[PDB]
Structure formats: C-alpha cells, structure tokens
Symmetry: C6
Amino acid sequence: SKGHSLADPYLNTLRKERVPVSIYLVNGIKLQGQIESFDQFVILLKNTVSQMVYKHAISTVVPSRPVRL
Amino acid sequence: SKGHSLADPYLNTLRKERVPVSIYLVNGIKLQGQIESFDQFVILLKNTVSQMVYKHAISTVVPSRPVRL
Amino acid sequence: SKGHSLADPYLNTLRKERVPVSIYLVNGIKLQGQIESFDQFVILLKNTVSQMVYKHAISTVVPSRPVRL
Amino acid sequence: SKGHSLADPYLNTLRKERVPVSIYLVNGIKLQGQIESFDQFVILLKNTVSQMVYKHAISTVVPSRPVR
Amino acid sequence: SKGHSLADPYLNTLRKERVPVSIYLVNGIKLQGQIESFDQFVILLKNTVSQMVYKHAISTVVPSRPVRL
Amino acid sequence: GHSLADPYLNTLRKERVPVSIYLVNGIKLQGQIESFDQFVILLKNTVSQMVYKHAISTVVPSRPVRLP
Ligand SMILES: [K+]
Ligand SMILES: [K+]
Ligand SMILES: [K+]
Ligand SMILES: [K+]
Ligand SMILES: [K+]
Ligand SMILES: [K+]
Ligand SMILES: [Zn+2]
Ligand SMILES: [Zn+2]
Ligand SMILES: [Zn+2]
Ligand SMILES: [Zn+2]
Ligand SMILES: [Zn+2]
Ligand SMILES: [Zn+2]
Ligand SMILES: [Zn+2]
Ligand SMILES: [Zn+2]
Ligand SMILES: [Zn+2]
Ligand SMILES: [Zn+2]
Ligand SMILES: [Zn+2]
Ligand SMILES: [Zn+2]
C-alpha cells in the first residue's frame, strides 16, 4: 500500500526460487530469463546473455508458474 | 486531493471487493483480472495467469461494474 | 508559480462545477467526462463507465467551456 | 544549474509578454496559445478554448519571437 | 559517479565552447543547435529560433566534435 | 538503493566492456561506458554521445560480467 512492501518481496521470492519470468517492456519487447538481482532502479535478468533492465522501462513481470510469499 | 487519498481507497475497494477490472497500459495493451495487492509502485493483477504491473506503465484502470468511493 | 498551486484549483473548479472535459493521454487517446474527484496521483473520470486515470499518462485536460481560476 | 532556475524565468517572462507559443508534446502533437499561468507540474495555455498541459507530456516550448 | 557530476560539467562545457550538438528526443526527433543555458529540468537550444527543451523527453545529446571535461 | 546499478556500471567502465544500449524507443546504441552519473551515461565510440538513463530500456554487455 505504501513503499515497496509488495514489489520487493515479490521480486526476491522470484529471485530466491529461480523462477523463469517474462518481462514486458513499455516498448512491447518481451524478455525472459531469471532474476539475478535487483535494486530500487534496476533488475538483472539472466539468460543466454544477460541484461540489466531499468524498471522505468517495465510494464509487467509475469512469472512462468504461479507464485506466493 | 492530498497524496494517494483517492488512489488508495479506490484500489483497496477493488481488491477487497474483488471486482473484475481491465487495466489499460500506456502502450495500448489491455490487462484483465483482479487486484490481489498493491503498494506505492506496483499492482498484482490476478487472473488464469497472474502478473505484476508497475503503476507507471498504467494509463487507466477500468472496473467491470460501478464502484462507490 | 509554486508546486501544484495551479493544478488543483483548476481541477477542483472542474470538479465542483461538473464541467464536461476532454482528457487527452500521452499515447494520443481521448477520454471524455466529468472529474468526480482526484488526488496527487489520479483522476476519477465519470460518464458511461467510470475510470481512474493516472496523471503521468495524461498530456492535456481541455474543458468543454471556459473557466475562471 | 539547479532547480527550475531557467524554466521559471523563461516561462514567467513568456507569460508576462503574452507571446504566442507553440508547445510540442512528446507524442508529437502541437499545442499553441499563450502561457496564462503555470506551476511545478502544469502550464495553462489559453486560446479559443483553454487547456491544462502536464509538463511531463511536453517535449519542446518554441516561442514565435525572441525573448530576453 | 554521484548526482549530476558528469551531466552538469558536460553540458556546461558544451555551452561554453559553444559546440553545435544534436539532441535526439525519445520520439525520434533530432533538434540541432547550440546550448545557451540549462537548468535541472530543461535545455535552451539556440538556433534560427530558440526553444526550451524539457530534458525528460531527451534520449541522447551528440556533440559535433569530441569534447573534454 | 542502487547497490547493483552503480557497481555494475562501474565494472563495464573499469574493464571497458563493449555494450549494446537499447533505448525505450527501440533504438540500439553501442560502444563503451567512459563515465556515468545518477542521470547520464557517456557512451564512447567514433561518435561520443551522452545518454539519459530515463531513455534506457536495457543495458546488454557483450560478454559475461560478474560483480564482486
Ligand atoms: K529487502
Ligand atoms: K514461494
Ligand atoms: K462497495
Ligand atoms: K467557472
Ligand atoms: K522580452
Ligand atoms: K570484472
Ligand atoms: Zn524495491
Ligand atoms: Zn529509472
Ligand atoms: Zn498509494
Ligand atoms: Zn515506476
Ligand atoms: Zn496536486
Ligand atoms: Zn504516477
Ligand atoms: Zn518551476
Ligand atoms: Zn507529472
Ligand atoms: Zn544538473
Ligand atoms: Zn520534467
Ligand atoms: Zn547511480
Ligand atoms: Zn532523467
């Protein structure tokens, strides 16, 4: 409801368990891989080659399998 | 008009009421489902497949039925 | 001027006076209605169906008739 | 180099002289008229019909005649 | 680095040496001229007609000839 | 916290890694990071350009990079 009390445990949960995710950007582009790390501004997506991904360019994050906290 | 004094009760009603909402993104992509939770930056949209949506990517939130503030 | 010291008087007038407005979004979509309420982050636009509109996705708010501020 | 130290005087001058301005939106649309007023977030652009333009939506402000 | 400890010196020097830069906006438009002045939020781009350019709508600023600091 | 973003960007800059830099509008840039601050990255090549971070979508390095 305020702060990152959902965004942060959601992303660490998806980090801690090596869940495959789809990352859609605002430009439409879809990324896939595993979330190595993240801070307030960026995410490290691990795949073939890996990518640091600015959260401001993120529309959605869709885990490959249902997750919880 | 101060702070999230509309955005927070509005969306909290939707989560509490579990109303179907359509979420329209700034890029012209349509999301549909129900709001499981929210914080200052994101909204968990629930559906057959479930997504996390960064607010900054959303243009309008459009419920399925009338909601009273 | 200073802060949002122009935005709210403009919006609160449009709300208190039930003025039909046209809200334009940065993606080039047009929305039409009357401003039910607002806060720092969103606007509640009513008409056919109601909807919450993120301000960061708006470019212009154009009244259907002139107003004094 | 900080604050709105160039924006404030540029905008406040433009209003005080009521120079016709063209405002170009990030989405490529062109709005036009006079700056009647402004704050940290928006610019009131009067014309046939007046409108509130969010600053974040603007790409460029391009006056008709030079300001000083 | 921290803060504006590269941006401010870079645009300042472009201002001083009066380098004709080319400013590409996120929307793909190239606005070519010289930097009279800037503050935290805008660049003023002198040319045949001068114009205020909101920095948040900037993608890149490319100098005509390489520069130092 | 930028306890990832800054070191990561330091490491491409320290070891001088060729990088691709995709812009939110879908253009790819490419070169090496000479320097950065909170707002910009200075991308080096035959064309030296300053890049605003708000414009960047993904930074993709050419080869594997680890962050001690
Ligand atoms: K944490
Ligand atoms: K779990
Ligand atoms: K209710
Ligand atoms: K009125
Ligand atoms: K003047
Ligand atoms: K290394
Ligand atoms: Zn966080
Ligand atoms: Zn960012
Ligand atoms: Zn909130
Ligand atoms: Zn955001
Ligand atoms: Zn306000
Ligand atoms: Zn917002
Ligand atoms: Zn100001
Ligand atoms: Zn804004
Ligand atoms: Zn600065
Ligand atoms: Zn701005
Ligand atoms: Zn940093
Ligand atoms: Zn920026």
